[PDB]
Symmetry: C2
Subunit: 285 residues, 2 copies
């Protein structure tokens, strides 16, 4: 009943987000029609939009304008999707397929896949700088754009993916290195949802900052724990380092920490709690 109301809040965020991306793409001057077509193809591959959903939900918690959350969600989804297209390339993960359809470089060509990835990374910065300027002071525009580029660059995602491709091949890798790799590759951009939202206000409570930072950290880690779990149950991963009921144990523990950090917000977090329960339920076998 209130499960029904909460799922609809999430669904309305998803549909709002996807509509906003269409409008945004249409508003950009793109002299090469192949870039426009491949961008659309890439951006609409059936992604679950978890990074936008988190931006809206965490943004609701601290009452930022949904117009602002529209910009931030778009930026992150563009960044995330650029990385997917590049990761799919033959030189990296070499994925012929993404979900149902062929992957970007198969539906178009490799050059187009590379260039589109390059363009979406830039577009995400363009979108923040041009559309956050009328809604927010310039120092706030700088601060949140900083967060994205810190997390996505050589200090984060770029190093993390490099290490994902090189290190995981051999069996010299420790749990500590695996955790570090995943924190850089996925963990930091998941964090960036919460950091970019927090950087919309001047002075947020330190208890609120810490609660969202705890949720972000532990949700980002546990997704990967869940991914490795599912991979093997439905060379070295979380499934190699932990056994069946041990990796299961880790899943529940990190979800509980994530759940507990939201107790501060009480009623206001019921939709985020509901999302967290669905995400946890992806492994309820």
């Amino acid at each position: 009943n209130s499960t029904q109301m909460n799922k609809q809040v999430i669904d309305k965020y998803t549909q709002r987000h996807e509509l906003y991306l269409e409008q945004l793409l249409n508003e950009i001057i793109i002299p090469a029609p192949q870039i426009r077509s491949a961008l659309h193809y890439a951006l609409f591959s059936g992604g679950k939009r978890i990074r936008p959903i988190l931006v809206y939900l965490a943004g609701d918690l601290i009452d930022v304008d949904q117009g602002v959350l529209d910009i931030i969600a778009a930026a992150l989804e563009l960044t995330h999707c650029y990385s997917l297209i590049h990761d799919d390339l033959p030189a990296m993960d070499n994925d012929d397929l993404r979900r149902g359809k062929p992957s970007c470089h198969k539906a178009f060509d490799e050059a187009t896949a590379i260039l589109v990835g390059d363009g979406m990374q830039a577009l995400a910065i363009e979108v923040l700088l041009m559309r956050l300027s009328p809604l927010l002071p310039a120092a706030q525009v700088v601060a949140i754009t900083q967060v994205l580029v810190n997390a996505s660059g050589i200090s984060g995602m770029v190093s993390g993916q490099s290490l994902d491709l090189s290190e995981l091949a051999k069996s010299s890798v420790t749990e500590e290195q695996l955790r570090e790799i995943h924190l850089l590759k996925t963990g930091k951009l998941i964090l960036a949802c919460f950091e970019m939202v927090l950087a919309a206000q001047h002075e947020v409570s330190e208890q609120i900052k810490s609660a969202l930072r705890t949720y972000g950290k532990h949700i980002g880690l546990v997704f990967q724990m869940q991914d490795d779990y599912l991979d093997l149950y439905a060379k070295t991963t979380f499934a190699t380092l932990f056994n069946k009921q041990q990796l299961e144990e880790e899943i529940a523990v990190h979800y509980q920490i994530a759940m507990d950090s939201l107790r501060l917000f009480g009623s206001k977090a019921a939709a985020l709690i509901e999302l967290t329960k669905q995400l946890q339920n992806r492994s309820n076998l």
Copy 2:
């Protein structure tokens, strides 16, 4: 004296730029050894890099802080370098050699080339945001970064390179289309040198703005004319297939002449840039 006073000014600007890049690179947390190794391999070479110099020389003309200039020029080279690494890949221009040495994917692998390119693009923006913020008002920081990201993205460089690959294969390309493709691919980024420099000041005069913009448009165009002139004559569709030898030679000359005359508002203050322009012109003249 003055034929070597201004010549050494150009030499000193490369040295300053390379030294600023090293310091910058050695400060960022780069958790992957492959990344910091390939970054350093790609970013440092012999000879001079034209975009940072143009930033320095245009920045001098309107007397902006040289600390600011270091940052803008670094971000520009990082953006330029990322694009070269990506264009060098087998999916695109397929270059085994960048200049004289093996390209980034040949010295390392294609994944490292893609990723380092990806990280350089992000770094250029990081450098702009963190380093300009104690020096300039936040509004200017935003507008400076806007210029680079508009010129480098899908409305500019990315469409420019996509159309360079798909359309130039055909020989049905007009002079009009060829001029548009090169403006999107390189023209806008070269123009960004002058435009990012202009966004450092609050009340720049429109006669100054227009004088830089004219130099920028004609210089970015004529480099590509020179490139097409060079690798056909001295050592598909190009400027060298659409213009003949003598026509191209005059097109080179006229566009450089327009570029020279654009700086006469500055006068003797521009003598550094004029000598560089004449140096850039004469790598087409050495055939004659």
